[PDB]
């Protein structure tokens, strides 16, 4: 698809068996999802942005379906106000910015 | 161009006669640049990011070149960790997300 940017670029994702809405975010290095359980090991991380930093849990090798396209990678989980699909998974679905 | 996302999508911008680096950020509603002098009056604005809220100065109808494309629109100025080009100006340069 081609997604214009008049509105926030939100898509449906499936993660951990759950359907969620998420923002396709070229400014995010990594994917950050609201608090939820994920299987396996995790380690703490701090991510910084507008407003300062947020503490998250980093889960590796998590499969996400993003608008119907499967991808695997690191997912950070924390009290983000918006689910964000970052570059680490955008690359995997072949996403590009075009102008 | 067609910009892939294996690295940060950084571009050169020109604002107030100065060249700066900025991140093309589809997850940003607004364009936010580090402290600098701009002409005219400004208005208050609060934006919310990953670490919480941030006060900024809102300047309207500012001339800015983004990767060689001319835009004229709102620029928020504040203590952001990186200059970010948000959807308000990405739409002006005709940018879309594609996969
Ligand atoms: C600021 C960027 C360098 C990094 N951010 C991604 C960015 O797209 C956020 C993504 C975002 C979006 C909504 C809420 C929190 C974070 N947008 C953002 O802060 O935009 C602000 C300016 O326009 C406004 O519109 C959205 C809030 C305002 S971030 O959310 O802090 C972040 C940083 C690191 C990772 N791995 C993941 C996300
Ligand atoms: Cl990854
Ligand atoms: Cl590629
Ligand atoms: Cl604008």
From Swiss-Prot, chains A, B:
Function in brief: Aspartyl protease that mediates proteolytic cleavages of Gag and Gag-Pol polyproteins during or shortly after the release of the virion from the plasma membrane. Cleavages take place as an ordered, step-wise cascade to yield mature proteins. This process is called maturation. Displays maximal activity during the budding process just prior to particle release from the cell. Also cleaves Nef and Vif, probably concomitantly with viral structural proteins on maturation of virus particles. Hydrolyzes host EIF4GI and PABP1 in order to shut off the capped cellular mRNA translation.
Organism: Human immunodeficiency virus type 1 group M subtype B (isolate BH5) (HIV-1)
Self-association state and partner proteins as the record states: Homodimer, whose active site consists of two apposed aspartic acid residues.
Name by which UniProt lists this protein: Protease
Chain ranges of the Peptidase A2 domain: 20-89
Active site: 25 (for protease activity)
Residues included from the entire protein: 501 to 599 of 1447
Region of interest (Dimerization of protease), ranges: 1-5, 49-55, 88-99
């Amino acid at each position: 698809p081609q997604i214009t940017l008049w509105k926030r670029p939100l898509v449906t994702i499936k993660i951990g068996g759950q359907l969620k809405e998420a923002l396709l975010d070229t400014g995010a290095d990594d994917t950050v999802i609201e608090e939820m359980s994920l299987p396996g090991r995790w380690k703490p991380k701090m991510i910084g942005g507008i407003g300062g930093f947020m503490k998250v849990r980093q889960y590796d090798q998590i499969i996400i379906e993003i608008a119907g396209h499967k991808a695997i990678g690191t997912v950070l989980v924390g009290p983000t106000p918006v689910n964000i699909i970052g570059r680490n998974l955008l690359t995997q679905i072949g996403a590009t910015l075009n102008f």
